[PDB]
Design a protein around this ligand. Structure first.
Ligand SMILES: Nc1ncnc2c1ncn2[C@@H]1O[C@H](COP(=O)(O)OP(=O)(O)OC[C@H]2O[C@@H](O)[C@H](O)[C@@H]2O)[C@@H](O)[C@H]1O
Length: 165
């Protein structure tokens, strides 16, 4: 219903403006998984993330930041802070789903009208950007995807997601 499942590399470049959503940690570790691959291609976008994580630390749980790709005018990256440390040191599954859910709240409100880093970098109306993500949390975090799926399901009629399998 709310979701549209796609097969492919979310990282392969697209031709429409979009917002990439991935779950993150408060530790300033763009360590492994798809977080790390966004750190290689978008180093400017990493530096903002590390810098935000020392300024505010574990204060970002349940919150999201939108920061620009810098390499692509049409790609905005969006972190949802769901856990306080990257890697196997992660929080337990209930919080990460609670913290995913709150964080996506902050996004939804933002489009209906985080983005300190965005000044000048926002080519299009924010509601024109498509939202894409991998199966965030189904890897390092370990949260099965059924679980995270239904949080996105309960944002139906608010936002629509393209998910990359
Ligand atoms: N090269 C890769 N290329 C494309 N997609 C990938 C790749 N690696 C992983 N993915 C997909 O990205 C999704 C999530 O990426 P993860 O690496 O698993 O990160 P995740 O566990 O979802 O959540 C972020 C977590 O990382 C920690 O730092 C912290 O605990 C934070 O909560 C998974 O569905 C996984 O299938």
């Amino acid at each position: 219903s709310n979701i549209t499942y796609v097969k492919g590399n979310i990282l392969k470049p697209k031709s429409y403006a979009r917002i990439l959503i991935h779950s993150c940690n408060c530790n300033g570790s763009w360590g492994g998984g798809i977080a790390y691959q966004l750190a290689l291609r978008y180093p400017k976008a990493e530096k903002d993330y590390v810098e935000v994580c020392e300024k505010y630390g574990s204060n970002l749980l349940g919150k999201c930041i939108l920061l620009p790709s810098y390499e692509n005018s049409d790609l905005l990256i969006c972190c949802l802070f769901t856990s306080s440390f990257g890697g196997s040191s992660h929080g337990e599954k209930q919080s990460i789903l609670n913290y995913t859910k709150l964080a996506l709240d902050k996004l939804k409100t933002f489009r209906e009208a985080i983005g300190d880093y965005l000044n000048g970098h926002i080519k299009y109306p924010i509601g024109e950007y498509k939202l894409e993500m991998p199966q965030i949390n189904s890897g390092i975090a370990g949260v099965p995807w059924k679980e995270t799926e239904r949080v996105l399901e309960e944002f139906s009629g608010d936002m629509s997601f393209t998910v990359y399998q």
